[PDB]
Amino acid sequence: GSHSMRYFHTSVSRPGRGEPRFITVGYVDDTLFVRFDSDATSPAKEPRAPWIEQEGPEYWDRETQISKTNTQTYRESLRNLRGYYNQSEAGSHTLQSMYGCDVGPDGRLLRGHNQYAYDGKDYIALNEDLRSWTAADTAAQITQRKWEAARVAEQLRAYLEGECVEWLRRYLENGKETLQRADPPKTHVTHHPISDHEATLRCWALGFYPAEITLTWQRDGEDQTQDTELVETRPAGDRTFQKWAAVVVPSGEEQRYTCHVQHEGLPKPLTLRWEP
C-alpha cells in the first residue's frame, strides 16, 4: 500500500583517467525507471520502464539538464571534500547521495530523505523534520554551516512535500498495472542429503514483487534464526525477485520443520513442509 520514490547519485573521481564520472538512477519502489551516465556517448536521461516513456520532451530536457548540472556540482563537491580531509589529489574518492519521499496508501507523505556519503561513510543527512541537518564529523559541519546559511533545507522541504509526492503519485497511476501489482512468491521445499546423518531443507520463494519478503524456518514451532542460512534477496532479471532459506536437519526429523512465508501478494501467509 505504501510506496517510495528515490534518486541515487554517484560521483567517482579517477585522477589520471579524466574527470569524475557521474551516474544517476531513479526508482519507484523496487523498479528502476530512469538512468543517466556522464560516460555515455551522448549523456542523457533515459527511460528504463515503459510507463515513463510517455513523458514528453519538456520532461526529458529538464531531467537531462539537471543531471548535466549535477555532474559539475558533484565534481566541485569532490574537490571541496578532498580539502576538508587534507587528502592528496592522487587518490580516487566516491561521493554518493540518495533522496526522495515515502507515501502511504492514501498518497500522503510519510517522510522525506536526503543524505550523503563520502568514501562509503555517512557524511551529512537531512533530519526527518526536513529543517535541520546531522553532520558526521567536523568536515561535514563545514557543509552544514554552508547549507544552513543558504537555507538549503527549505528548498528540499518544498520539493519533498510537493513535487516529490505529486510526481510519485503520477508515476504510480501511469504505471499502476505493474507498480501497484504485487506478484506473490511461488514456493516449494527441496531436500538435499548431506551425509547419512543430515540433510538440507531449502525453502524457495520465486517470482515475487516487490522484494520485501519474510522467509523463516521453524522446528517444533520455534524459529530457527541462528541455524538458518538466508541468502540475500536477488533479482531474477524479469522485475521479480528470488530468495531461499535453508536448515540442516537430522535424518528422519524432516517433518518437525516448517517454512513460513509472508509477502504482500499472498492472500494468506504460507506454511510449507517437505513433501517427499
Binding site: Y7, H9, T24, G26, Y59, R62, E63, I66, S67, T69, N70, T73, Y74, E76, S77, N80, L81, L95, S97, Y99, Y116, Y123, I124, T143, K146, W147, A150, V152, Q155, L156, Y159, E163, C164, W167
Partner: peptide, 9 residues
C-alpha cells in the same frame, strides 16, 4: 521528477 537545486558540499 528530480530536484533541480542540488548544492555544492
Amino acid at each position: 521528477r528530480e530536484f533541480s537545486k542540488e548544492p555544492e558540499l
